[PDB]
Structure formats: structure tokens, C-alpha cells
């Protein structure tokens, strides 16, 4: 045997009743699905959103992909990056001819088992040099969501699906999520991405920014094959990866140079990393859990739509993730503390389970901040001044040393205008004596305790 398929991940078939509320359902399956990292969700037979579009008027700029195991690729950036151009129809014609010519078979007579074995053969063989193309970008005027959105008059059926929880345009900005409260520009993370696939086009092993959840819907076409690893095994996987492809682990100059790669799940299984698989067919959802590594490839021409989200469950993990970024010197997409304080400042209109969970995260934030400020005072930093960090562009408030986005506090020095360090890296700013430094802070401890009290009242 040259490829042993991993065991299958969990598959859920909710009733209409269960399927009514997405967040309730995800909370239900969570103890099972978080053991496997990914899971598949089949909607009720009824639930059939209308996909409709003109294949001649949708155009997009294709990305090109070489298919070599352990070779470095860079995560897709929101920028089009292209002079070349396909309509959905001309891409479909390219994609079907490619698959048909590769196997000398009609496109739907190629078994999924065989495409999977062939994918892993061709990525491991050096002389084979297959390149494929694919589409990836957030919605725009030239290529929009596959779900119904408001604007054009809509049919009664379209109106049914316009407000669904499972309409992925809605899911980021619903109530039991926490990304919706963020006022910062985080386009890449709260807007759905649109993916046009062809045979063998693939996505490298990765986890979502800030260890968020994600959910992917296959609108139409041939299936999408997935591999997933549970969150508790993320560091095992990373150690296996570091050993075999250490170049992917050199320091990131920014978030547009994140390096990722294809790697055979059998390799992971040999090093005792648990891995699960699934084929996602048209009309099905795949959900990924916090810090669950995933990868996959398309069986043929298809169209998927995916979005990030964060439940109240995720809040403690969000804080651990930012700490982990600090240890690695990795850039943040947003400030976690800034998001917590924003929610606290809206305590009266918050859902009450949300208020209760924000309260507990804020209590940890405040006790850590108390300890850090005492430490830098003992270093001889005496002068201080309030500062509205949320007004600075992100690139003007990153720690010089660990790149974290400052919000609660930072240290500055008149000696190096415009530069900041977080309170973990006070000794990294410059060589002036500590009495020349200034502590810049968003809130006094006395501002903070009443903010947390408002949450306590709302939670009762
Ligand atoms: O379903 C997919 N996920 C994903 C992720 C990143 C990519 F560049 C491309 C894809 C799609 O094929
Ligand atoms: Cl190859
Ligand atoms: Mn993903
Ligand atoms: Mn350090
Ligand atoms: Zn720092």
C-alpha cells in the first residue's frame, strides 16, 4: 500500500429543530467534534438555498499552484494580484478538459478513491510537475456571494434564506459570536471567502487566525476532500513539520509572508499524530474547531464559501493565542484586550451569557495588568500619561520586540519618538535610563473595576 486513508471524521444530520440555531447546534456537537478537529454537517433535505448566477458575467483572476510535497507556498492575500482572467464558464471548461485528459475518462466516472491516491502519488514524485489554477478572494462586484444578499428584487425562496443563521454572510455578525462587536477593520476575517476549485487544486495545512472556528459550505460541483487534526495535537503536528521542512519556520517578516505546505497525512500518522478525513459533497458544511489543523484538495470543478467565527466558548483560547503569538513574535490581526473592553463598554445591550463570559476574561486581564504595572514601576519607570491606543493605526502600536498590538499599555521614550514596547519588553526600547521612560495607559485600574461591575450586573 502506498496510501492508507485516515479514519472518517464525525457526520451530523440535524433535524429542522436542531438546525434552527447554528450556535446551539455547534455547542451541542462540540465535545465530539473537537476530538477530531473537523466534522461534517448535512442540512435537512428541505434546506436548499437557491444558487443562481450568470456564468458569463462572473469573472476572476486565477492563482497558480505547483503540487510538490513539503515545498513552501504562501497563504493567499486578499489582493487580486492579476492581469490574467477567467469567466466562471471559461474556467469550468479548462477544469473539465484538464481532468478528462489526465485520466482519459469522463469527469464523473473517476472514482474519488482514485483521485485521492493519485494526488498523494503526484505530490511526492519529483519528475512529475503538475500545475493547476484556482480562485480565492472575498466577495466583490465582479464575483459576489453564492448566498442571497440584500439589494435587484428577490424571489420568495431567496427571502427565506436571506436571514438564515447558516447563510454565511450573517454568521460573522450574529449575536452569540464575538467578532461582530469588533470595530476595527478586519475584512479578511469577518467577510466570507469564495473558492473556485479544479481537480487537485489544494489548500495547505493551516489553522485560522487567532485560533478561531471556521465553517465551509460547498455550493455546487465535485466533492472536496479534507484532512483534519484535533486542537489538542497542534504542537505535535508542528514538531513533525519542523523536523521535515524547517524552512517554513523561519521568522515571518509580516502577515503576507506566512509559509505553508502540503504534507501526506500518513507521515503524520506514522509519528502518532491523530488525523481524520472526509469527502464534502455539494450541499454539505464542514466545521473546523479552534487550533485544529486542516488541509485538502478538490476532486474536480466546484464552488465553496467559507467564513471565520468565534463563540463565547472561544474567549479563553483567544487570550492564550495572543500570548502564543507574543512568544513567537507573530503579528496580530486585532487586539484581543481592545475587543473585551469594547464589549464591556456595551454591557447593557449584551446577551447575558456573553456578559458573564466576558466578565471572567476581563478579571484575568485586570489581574495580569496590575502585576505588569507594578513590575515596571520597580524598574524605575515613574512618569505616566493616558493614551487612546484604539485611535492609532495598528502599525503605529506594535511592540518593537514581540510585534504584539498594544492597547492596555505600553512604554515610550522621548529618545525614540513613535516607538513602543509592551510591558513584557521594557528593556528593549533604548539605552536611556528608566526615569526618562513613560508609561502610556488606556485605563486606570480605577476605571477598569466599574466596567467589570457593569458586566456583573447585566449577567445578574
Ligand atoms: O475550500 C477551500 N479552502 C481553502 C483555503 C485556502 C485556499 F487558498 C483555498 C481553499 C479552498 O479550496
Ligand atoms: Cl510533483
Ligand atoms: Mn481554513
Ligand atoms: Mn522574548
Ligand atoms: Zn513586546
Summarize it.
GO terms for molecular function: DNA binding; histone binding; histone demethylase activity; histone H3K4 demethylase activity; histone H3K4me/H3K4me2/H3K4me3 demethylase activity; nucleic acid binding; sequence-specific double-stranded DNA binding; transcription corepressor activity. Helices cover about 30% and strands about 20% of the residues. The protein contains 12 helices and 19 strands.
State the main characteristics:
monomer; 460 residues; alpha+beta; Jelly Rolls; 8-stranded mixed β-sheet; 4-stranded antiparallel β-sheet; 12 helices; globular; binds (3R)-5-fluoro-3-hydroxy-1,3-dihydro-2H-indol-2-one; binds chloride ion; binds manganese (II) ion; binds zinc ion; Lysine-specific demethylase 5B; oxidoreductase; jarid1B; PLU1; fragment screening
Explain what this protein looks like in three dimensions:
The protein is α+β, with helices and mostly antiparallel strands and 460 residues long. It has 2 domains: 1-332, Sandwich (Jelly Rolls), CATH 2.60.120; 333-460, no CATH class. The chain has 12 helices and 19 strands. It has an 8-stranded mixed sheet with strand order 1-2-14-10-16-8-7-4. Strands 9-15-11-13 form a 4-stranded antiparallel sheet, covered by helices on one side. It has a 3-stranded mixed sheet with strand order 17-19-18, with no helix packed on it. Helix 10 (336-344) packs across helix 11 and helix 11 (352-377) packs antiparallel against helix 12. It is globular and about 75 Å long. The structure holds (3R)-5-fluoro-3-hydroxy-1,3-dihydro-2H-indol-2-one (0TI), chloride ion (CL), manganese (II) ion (2 copies) and zinc ion. Zinc ion is lined by residues 399, 401-402, 404, 421-422, 424-425. It is classed as oxidoreductase. The entry lists the keywords oxidoreductase, jarid1B, PLU1, fragment screening, structural genomics consortium, SGC, diamond I04-1, pandda. The assembly is monomeric. Crystal structure of the catalytic domain of human JARID1B in complex with Maybridge fragment 4,5-dihydronaphtho(1,2-b)thiophene-2- carboxylicacid (N11181a) (ligand modelled based on PANDDA event map, SGC - Diamond I04-1 fragment screening). The protein is lysine-specific demethylase 5B.
Amino acid at each position: 500500500s502506498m496510501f492508507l486513508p485516515p479514519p472518517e471524521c464525525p457526520v451530523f444530520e440535524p433535524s429542522w429543530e436542531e438546525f434552527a440555531d447554528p450556535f446551539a447546534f455547534i455547542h451541542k456537537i462540540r465535545p465530539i467534534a473537537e476530538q477530531t478537529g473537523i466534522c461534517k454537517v448535512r442540512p435537512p433535505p428541505d434546506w436548499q438555498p437557491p444558487f443562481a448566477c450568470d456564468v458569463d458575467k462572473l469573472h476572476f483572476t486565477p492563482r497558480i499552484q505547483r503540487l510538490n510535497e513539503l515545498e513552501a507556498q504562501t497563504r493567499v492575500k486578499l489582493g487580486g494580484g492579476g492581469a490574467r482572467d477567467y469567466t466562471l464558464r471559461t474556467f469550468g471548461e479548462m477544469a473539465d478538459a484538464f481532468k478528462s485528459d489526465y485520466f482519459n475518462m469522463p469527469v464523473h466516472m473517476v472514482p474519488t478513491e482514485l483521485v485521492e491516491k493519485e494526488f498523494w502519488r503526484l505530490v511526492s514524485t519529483i519528475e512529475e510537475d503538475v500545475t493547476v489554477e484556482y480562485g480565492a478572494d472575498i466577495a466583490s462586484k465582479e464575483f459576489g456571494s453564492g448566498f442571497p444578499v440584500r439589494d435587484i428584487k428577490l424571489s420568495p425562496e431567496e427571502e427565506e434564506y436571506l436571514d438564515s443563521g447558516w447563510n454565511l454572510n450573517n454568521m460573522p455578525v450574529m449575536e452569540q459570536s464575538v467578532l461582530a462587536h469588533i470595530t476595527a477593520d478586519i475584512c479578511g476575517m469577518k467577510l466570507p471567502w469564495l473558492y473556485v476549485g479544479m481537480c487537485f487544486s489544494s489548500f495547505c495545512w493551516h489553522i485560522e487566525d487567532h485560533w478561531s472556528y471556521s465553517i465551509n459550505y460547498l455550493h455546487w460541483g465535485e466533492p472536496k476532500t479534507w484532512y483534519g487534526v484535533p486542537g489538542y495535537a497542534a504542537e505535535q503536528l508542528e514538531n513533525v513539520m519542523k523536523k521535515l521542512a524547517p524552512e517554513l519556520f523561519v521568522s515571518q517578516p509580516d502577515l503576507l509572508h506566512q509559509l505553508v505546505t502540503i504534507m501526506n497525512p500518513n507521515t503524520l500518522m506514522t509519528h502518532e499524530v491523530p488525523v481524520y478525513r472526509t469527502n464534502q459533497c455539494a450541499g454539505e458544511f464542514v466545521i473546523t474547531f479552534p487550533r485544529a489543523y486542516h488541509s485538502g484538495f478538490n476532486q474536480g470543478f466546484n464552488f465553496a464559501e467559507a467564513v471565520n467565527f468565534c463563540t463565547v466558548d472561544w474567549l479563553p483560547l483567544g487570550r492564550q493565542c495572543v500570548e502564543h503569538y507574543r512568544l513567537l513574535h507573530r503579528y496580530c490581526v486585532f487586539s484581543h484586550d481592545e475587543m473585551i473592553c469594547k464589549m464591556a463598554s456595551k454591557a447593557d445591550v449584551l446577551d447575558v451569557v456573553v456578559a458573564s463570559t466576558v466578565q471572567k476574561d476581563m478579571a484575568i486581564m485586570i489581574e495580569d495588568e496590575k502585576a505588569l504595572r507594578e513590575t515596571v514601576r520597580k524598574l524605575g519607570v515613574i512618569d505616566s500619561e493616558r493614551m487612546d491606543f484604539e485611535l492609532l493605526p495598528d502599525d503605529e502600536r506594535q511592540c518593537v520586540k514581540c510585534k504584539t498590538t498594544c492597547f492596555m499599555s505600553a512604554i515610550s521614550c522621548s529618545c525614540k519618538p513613535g516607538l513602543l514596547v509592551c510591558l513584557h519588553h521594557v528593556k528593549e526600547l533604548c539605552s536611556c535610563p528608566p526615569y526618562k521612560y513613560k508609561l502610556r495607559y488606556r485605563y486606570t485600574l480605577d476605571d477598569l473595576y466599574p466596567m467589570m461591575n457593569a458586566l456583573k450586573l447585566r449577567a445578574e
